[PDB]
Amino acid sequence: PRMPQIRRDITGLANLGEVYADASPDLFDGLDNAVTTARTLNEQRGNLDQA
Amino acid sequence: GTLLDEAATAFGGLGPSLQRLVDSTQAIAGDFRANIDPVNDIIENSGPIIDS
Numbered sequence: 001p002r003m004p005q006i007r008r009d010i011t012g013l014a015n016l017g018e019v020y021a022d023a024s025p026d027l028f029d030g031l032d033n034a035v036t037t038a039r040t041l042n043e044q045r046g047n048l049d050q051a
Numbered sequence: 052g053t054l055l056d057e058a059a060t061a062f063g064g065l066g067p068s069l070q071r072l073v074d075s076t077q078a079i080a081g082d083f084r085a086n087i088d089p090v091n092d093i094i095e096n097s098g099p100i101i102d103s
Contacts, residue, residue, distance in 0.1 A: 002094050009094065012101035 041048065062069075083090070 002091065005094050005098055008098045009101065012098060016101050
């Protein structure tokens with residue numbers, strides 16, 4: 001009785017996978033540089049609190 | 052003779068393997084029935100999130 005829902009789930013899963021595969025490289029480059037600036041923010045937490 | 056040869060070829064030494072097959076099938080089916088409400092919830096509610 002819940003097979004149309006299964007078809008909907010599989011179709012949505014394929015579409016979402018394609019969307020994420022398209023959007024992943026920008027997100028991962030941003031995550032690399034965000035890791036760099038996050039390391040910088042971590043090394044100076046006291047400076048940020050005083051600020 | 053032909054049928055017995057075919058049965059020997061198909062069931063040569065599959066004793067343990069067929070036993071494992073049947074035991075696995077029964078265990079999986081029983082556990083699946085025992086956990087059918089989570090499967091129903093996954094199937095009927097994963098659509099909205101993925102579609103969004």
